[PDB]
Amino acid sequence: AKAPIRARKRVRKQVSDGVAHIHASFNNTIVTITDRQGNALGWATAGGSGFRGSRKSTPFAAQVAAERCADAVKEYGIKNLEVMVKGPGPGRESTIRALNAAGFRITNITDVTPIPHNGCRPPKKRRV
Amino acid sequence: MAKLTKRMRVIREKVDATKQYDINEAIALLKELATAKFVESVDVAVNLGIDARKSDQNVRGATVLPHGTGRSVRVAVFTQGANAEAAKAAGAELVGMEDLADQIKKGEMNFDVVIASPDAMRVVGQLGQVLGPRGLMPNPKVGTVTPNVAEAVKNAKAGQVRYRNDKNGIIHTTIGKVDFDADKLKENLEALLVALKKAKPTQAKGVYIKKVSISTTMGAGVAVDQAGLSASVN
RNA sequence: UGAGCCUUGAUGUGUAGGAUAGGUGGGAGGCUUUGAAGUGUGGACGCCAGUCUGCAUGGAGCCGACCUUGAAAUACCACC
After folding, report:
1. DSSP letter at B121?
2. CA B137 and chain centroid, separation
3. After which residues is chain B broken (C to N over 2.5 A)?
4. Is A46 inside any structural domain?
5. Nearest to B100 by CA among B114, B117, B82, B87
6. Residue B168 CA to nucleotide C12 C1', Å?
7. Is residue A42 part of a domain?
8. Residue B43: beta bridge partners?
């Protein structure tokens, strides 16, 4: 018997299709790919992609989180996305651009930021 | 008991159960279960209560049986140190090293004994090989050689067989041709059970014989009842 | 849904090779249900020339040992 192959001969899912849900938050950015029924399949973040507090809130840190999230679902054999966005953070387009350029297929962009009919009293920070 | 491949199937249409017979009906069925165009040699398989997995602690030796075995009594000796001419004159058909390795790898493979001297055994099994470890070759690891070539051939030409195991509870040995009667077979079995008790290793059981079966070459096996000389409760 | 016991089909450590020399021993081109050879080709497994499997197909035919990996063999059995 010879030595085994350098790369796998088989793979346990091949689900082809999903949705990238982004929460581009005011201090971070969090990216998660979920199947079309909303059960999450794999994820990655700004801050977990080698950036601390001081850097994790930037579109450049988010851009790398999107690539790390494309790699996170790589094994499920998904390639096709459409995109949903929430939060004030800048992780909202640099993400999509590096996602589509990291061998995945972007197809639709829709916002899913929740807005109220007035609602409850907002917090105050720094007397703002 | 039949084995399946796409390349040879003929044993499948000769047996249809894993079942055990008295010896007077086991050979009656086995004369049917021959598949080859030539009339086949018949073997026992002697399954053992042995727990050895080290080659030196498994059974090893040889013996002469009261009746024939369908083995050829053509005898060969590998030697480059020991008395070649005294071996040939003692009744060996073949002596050499240069083309004995090819002769065993050609024609009919039906040798009764392939001997080496330890003078040549170096290139027969250990550092060199000439057929690979198999019963047809003298075994690279267990004691199958002597520098008394002229004695070893004189024992061999009597229709003596060879038994050993290595990691499994197995002695397979030829016992006749399939035309044999169940008394000739039982009488060679009782002779061999003496000779396995006399060459018994420390790591074998009280119940030294697990099961016994009879099997022809190209053809199938059937199982037999007999295990004789080896009950523990006396 | 976990484990064992068991029977069988599949599976094989000496590395390399196209690959797959587990042990032991016997033996060598074989039918009665099937087909391998070989040509072509789908499946599965794998190392990329391989093995396991099937169909067109031979079915009184045909692959070993030459060839080839290696110090060394290799139709094809039974036993564990």
Report:
1. H
2. 11
3. none
4. yes
5. B114
6. 15
7. yes
8. B174, B215
Q: Is the CB of B10 under 7 A from strand C?
A: yes
Q: Nucleotide C31: nearest residue by CA–C1'?
A: B10
Residues 41-100/B with CB < 7 A to strand C: 41, 43, 45, 47, 55, 70-72
B210 Cβ nearer than 7 Å to chain C strand? yes
| Residues β-bridged to residue B130 | none
Provide the number of structural domains found in chain A.
Answer: 1
Report the protein residue whose CA lies nearest the C1' of nucleotide C8: B3
Burial degree of B42 (CB within 10 A; 0-12, 13-18, 19+): buried
Asked if residues B78 and B153 have their Cβ atoms less than 8 Å apart, the reply is no
SS3 call for B195:
helix
Q: Which nucleotide is nearest to B213 (CA to C1')?
A: C79
Residue B154 Cβ under 7 A from any strand C atom: no
Distance B51 CA to C28 C1' (A): 33
**Please, are residues B23 and B175 in contact by the beta-carbon 8 Å criterion?**
no
Hey, what amino acid is at A24?
A
Phi first, then psi, for residue B83 (nearest 5°) are -65, 90
Residue B172, phi then psi, degrees to nearest 5: -105, 135
Q: Are the CB atoms for A24 and A93 separated by under 8 Å?
A: no
- Which residue from B69, B136, B198, B58 is spatially nearest to B116, judged by alpha carbons? B136
A8 domain residue, yes or no: no
Would you call A6 exposed, middle or buried from its count of C-beta atoms within 10 A (0-12, 13-18, 19+)? exposed
Q: Is the CB of B225 under 7 A from strand C?
A: no
For the CA of B83 and the C1' of C24, the distance in angstroms is 30
Question: SS in 3 state form for A48-84?
Answer: CCCCCCCCCCCHHHHHHHHHHHHHHHHHHCEEEEEEE
Question: Does residue A108 fall inside a structural domain?
Answer: yes
Experimental method: cryo-EM
Please, what sign has the CA dihedral across residues B151, B155, B156, B158?
positive
Give one word for B91, left, alpha or beta, with left for phi > 0 and alpha for psi -120 to 50: left
